Write a structure and sequence with these properties.
homodimer; alpha/beta; 14 helices; structural genomics, unknown function
């Protein structure tokens, strides 16, 4: 169950750092040109460090990923893209996992190439799962109840993610068909969009209200109501909240109203975010860092940097 | 070009019928069992549609062209791909004479990973080869720079004419879905306004700004964005999804936005068309999915809705 898995991981890595793995065309292009020039150092690390993890865990395109160096030149453009896409992902994971509570993969980055990116996405989940590292698919899924069961299957049965993000504007009833499977008697964790990071997020989340309660608060309340009716907490899973690292006032409000809630915070001011949303159980406030790590000349060092800033902030907060 | 393409299609088929193509495991199992005991009748029709599969399909073509003798040479996974694609082709072939547009809900295609996205790509390729209007119902949402990935998947990869969008995060995302600066291209879409699910009132109606319900506010903000983007000048549109069971909201939306494109899933049919009426029929799509795709005779069932709509328009238009 995810509450225990997340707890146990937090004890092991002693952080709330959530690493965002959102590879784009630039990243893969740059990875490919760098590898061709540094004697494939990172690809060689992925293959030879590192347990022979690829050969034991990967089920899609395994032989492409294992291609001998002389033979890379001869891959089709599609197979080459698949090669460097996967290897970039494995490189980031291998270099940063020592500092990572959880990895969050945003689905948007994986779908634009059709099947090739979804195959990569599956590989990434298989790879992380082989190390029991917590995972999340950030897909902001929504549809009517019977239809959303398809996303439940994709995310929790196919990818075997620990968690996902969900947009409940249609209604909270969808939660019963994402976070619970009656036939399997299984429960799954998720984070619902409460306050997002985009500049215009006030338009509906803040400007709309009911009896002087802003929309984001009403939506958090309705979400918790559904979570309680589902009895999800009793099953050691949770339905939490996405609250942007720039939404300091909303973070304070949500944390105070729901002191035991699990929060995901994308968008990293870091000190104010952590102070306002603080929980002694660090895993209940995930701080997502993606591009600052994945686009870094040195993602290990950079992940370390965020890891140390967080320690210092908790030192300061808990003084 | 979509405003023109839809108008032209409406001129050919003379209906607002939108056919939902949402194949589930039941459908594919049933189709396979039926084909194996009717002598592959529908597969035969698919492939006889003059070599359309052979000329158009670029993914798993050899598998799809497998002779019925050799379908058991197919691994269970290839068989699944085979009947999934052929089921979709069978639906389209049997119903296209009555269809203004096909709406494919992304949810039905993703749960098998690559397999279903391959089939989805095939479905769009097939429809696009006949220039038939298409929509991907995916209810997309993210931050602007991230949503560009959805724009690429939907409008560049699949080459859909349209999609559905959830703007609860903000309307700024519309600029990165419905417009591509680098290519100078515009694309059409329908934004969620009033959904069909029983509990859609919690946020869509109960939330408000003083006297104006959320769904109205969201429709206004959407139109504001579309105007800012100059989408209409470029022969595209940003429209609204309004449930066929939401008669009251449909009336308010059509009255306030008399020239808007509306998609109505759910199908009462009379009240929907009456309340949401536009003399340009394409401006109120009536989506019918399961009632057609799960019918023992999808042609007759589609024909039935086609005729029902003809009769309603007779009644409404004096």
């Amino acid at each position: 169950h995810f509450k225990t898995k997340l707890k146990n991981r937090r004890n092991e890595v002693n952080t709330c750092l959530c690493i965002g793995l959102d590879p784009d065309e630039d990243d893969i292009k740059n990875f490919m040109r760098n590898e061709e020039k540094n004697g494939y150092k990172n690809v060689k690390n992925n293959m030879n460090s590192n347990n022979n993890r690829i050969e034991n865990v990967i089920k899609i395109g395994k032989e492409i990923l294992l291609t001998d160096e002389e033979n890379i030149e001869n891959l089709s453009e599609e197979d080459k893209f698949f090669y460097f896409f996967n290897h970039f992902c494995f490189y980031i994971i291998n270099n940063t996992k020592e500092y990572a509570l959880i990895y969050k993969m945003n689905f948007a980055f994986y779908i634009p190439y059709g099947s090739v990116g979804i195959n990569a996405l599956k590989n990434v989940f298989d790879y992380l799962n082989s190390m029991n590292i917590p995972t999340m698919l950030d897909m902001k899924i929504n549809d009517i109840g019977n239809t959303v069961k398809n996303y439940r299957k994709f995310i929790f049965e196919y990818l075997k993610s620990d968690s996902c993000t969900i947009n409940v504007y249609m209604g909270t009833s969808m939660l019963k068909d994402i976070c619970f499977d009656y036939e399997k008697n299984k429960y799954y964790s998720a984070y619902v969009l409460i306050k997002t990071t985009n500049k215009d997020s006030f338009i509906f989340q803040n400007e709309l209200s009911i009896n002087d309660k802003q929309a984001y608060i009403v939506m958090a309340e309705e979400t918790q109501k559904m979570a309680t009716d589902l009895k999800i907490d009793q099953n050691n899973e949770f339905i939490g909240f996405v609250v942007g690292s720039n939404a300091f006032e909303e973070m304070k409000i949500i944390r105070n109203k729901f002191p035991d809630s699990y929060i995901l915070s994308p968008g990293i001011d870091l000190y104010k975010t952590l102070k306002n949303g603080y929980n002694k159980d660090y895993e209940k406030l995930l701080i997502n860092v993606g591009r600052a790590i994945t686009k870094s000349p040195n993602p290990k060092k950079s992940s370390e940097s965020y890891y140390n800033q967080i320690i210092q902030i908790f030192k300061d907060i808990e003084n």
